Design a protein around this ligand. Structure first.
Ligand SMILES: CO[C@H]1O[C@H](CO)[C@@H](O)[C@H](O)[C@H]1NC(C)=O
Ligand SMILES: [Ca+2]
Length: 124
């Protein structure tokens, strides 16, 4: 790396929707981050403690597919490893088709509306 992840923690005015974040990472030749196992989760947690980005929320590459698949990763891979927060994904008010990371030690995931403005994490 110059499995590689990079945090994008932005000021209030420079956060992005899920689609804007996905396009940003793809313009770099990468994608929104997928977390495929415990090792990858630890790597990202170690990046958060390095930056003081505690408690912050980040887009991951989680996106709802067909009703049959449930959530998938934007980079193509299926969701095998899961770390949803308890009760999630709950599709609250039926409008939550993207996934975010709560960047605290639990490293848990939540489904949320894709037009929410968040920080994000790229993989490359
Ligand atoms: C603040 O959290 C609540 O709203 C978000 C969407 O804003 C939801 O994504 C989230 O699931 C829901 N939590 C519960 C317990 O329903
Ligand atoms: Ca939710």
């Amino acid at each position: 790396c110059p499995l590689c992840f990079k945090l994008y923690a932005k000021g209030k005015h420079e956060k992005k929707t899920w689609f804007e974040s996905r396009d940003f990472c793809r313009a770099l030749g990468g994608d929104l981050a997928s977390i495929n196992n415990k090792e990858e989760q630890q790597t990202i947690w170690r990046l958060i403690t390095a930056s003081g980005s505690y408690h912050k929320l980040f887009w991951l590459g989680l996106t709802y597919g067909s009703p049959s698949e449930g959530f998938t990763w934007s980079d193509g891979s299926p969701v095998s490893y899961e770390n949803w927060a308890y009760g999630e994904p709950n599709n609250y008010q039926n409008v939550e088709y993207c996934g975010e990371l709560k960047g605290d030690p639990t490293m848990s995931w939540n489904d949320i509306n894709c037009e929410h403005l968040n920080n994000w994490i790229c993989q490359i």
